[PDB]
Subunit: 140 residues, 3 copies
């Protein structure tokens, strides 16, 4: 049989963090009491480009950080920082203009303690994409 | 995890109509009471070919139109006409013979009043396609 | 709209059996009272390679057969035998080790009587595939 259904398009997405206990040499302007180096990221499978449909990723860190809303406007959509505690990060994915989409919000608990990593391989499902954005989606 | 599931393949489809209110100069042969120019269509995104899986499209017009069953047997799957009233069109989609499919029947309210367009970007889901039609679908 | 969802990936699969009445000329070491030739198989659409994700296919036959656990380790993932009766065959599909998947079991009723064929065109859905397995899946 055949039926008309609502159009939807999927995009695999990888996000989370890696973490590292610092040995002896710390980054320059790093607070003295910080114990770990960590990296929060949003990327594609096989580290393929995702910037064709993602314009910008913003990470909201714990308020103890200076300028805690960190906007990354070009790939790699990641941020490496120092710390001493585990906390929630708000990951905001901003799609390219022609998508006419709201910010994709989601959460990640930063893991430092048992290199440690906390990583997720999920799917972004776009409901009812417009013709322009569909083209961009299909460009790969 | 892995599971056996019924096979399903989707094809994006764009259908609907554009309309324009004519001025004092009307096309030759146009009935005097007719106020609008309009086009009913079924197409692919980015106007990509759809005849590889769609053999013909039939637009069933209001019975006040002469020969109201309009069969379009080659792309573009569209017709242009004059009119005064908004009315339902039964769109009949005939898939290529390999599909072994019944006719896909759907409907579209012709819109003339707030160019005016009523256009849908949906998905045709094919349930349990046969091996031969699957190949055609996969060829694109 | 956009939502984060669990990743899943589909691969179409074709499986089942063909059968033929032997009639007059028999195989070399086939049991004398066997009446039919039959082939049990797992394959891809258009007979395309599936060994890129499937490592091994095992056909468990009726225990009236010698060594009824039959392991096919390379494509074509098929087995040709003789017989005189219809019985349940357990098809065990072993995915490539990067999948880190359990065996996928399915049932086939071997059909001999109304060439006779019992063939299915379904879909293997992989839930939460790991990145390395996803890469192999995307190879196509």
């Amino acid at each position: 049989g055949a039926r008309i259904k609502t159009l939807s398009v999927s995009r695999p997405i990888i996000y989370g963090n890696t973490a590292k206990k610092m040995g002896s040499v710390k980054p320059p302007n790093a607070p003295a009491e910080h114990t770990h180096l960590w990296t929060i990221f949003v990327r594609g499978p096989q580290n393929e480009d995702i910037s064709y449909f993602i314009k910008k990723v913003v990470f909201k860190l714990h308020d103890t950080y200076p300028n805690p809303v960190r906007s990354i406007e070009a790939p790699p959509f990641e941020l490496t920082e120092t710390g001493w505690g585990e906390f929630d990060i708000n990951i905001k994915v901003y799609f390219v203009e022609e998508a006419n989409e709201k910010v994709l919000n989601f959460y990640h608990r930063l893991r430092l303690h048992p290199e440690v990593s906390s990583v997720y391989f999920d799917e972004i499902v776009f409901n009812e994409p417009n013709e322009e954005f569909f083209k961009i989606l299909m460009s790969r």
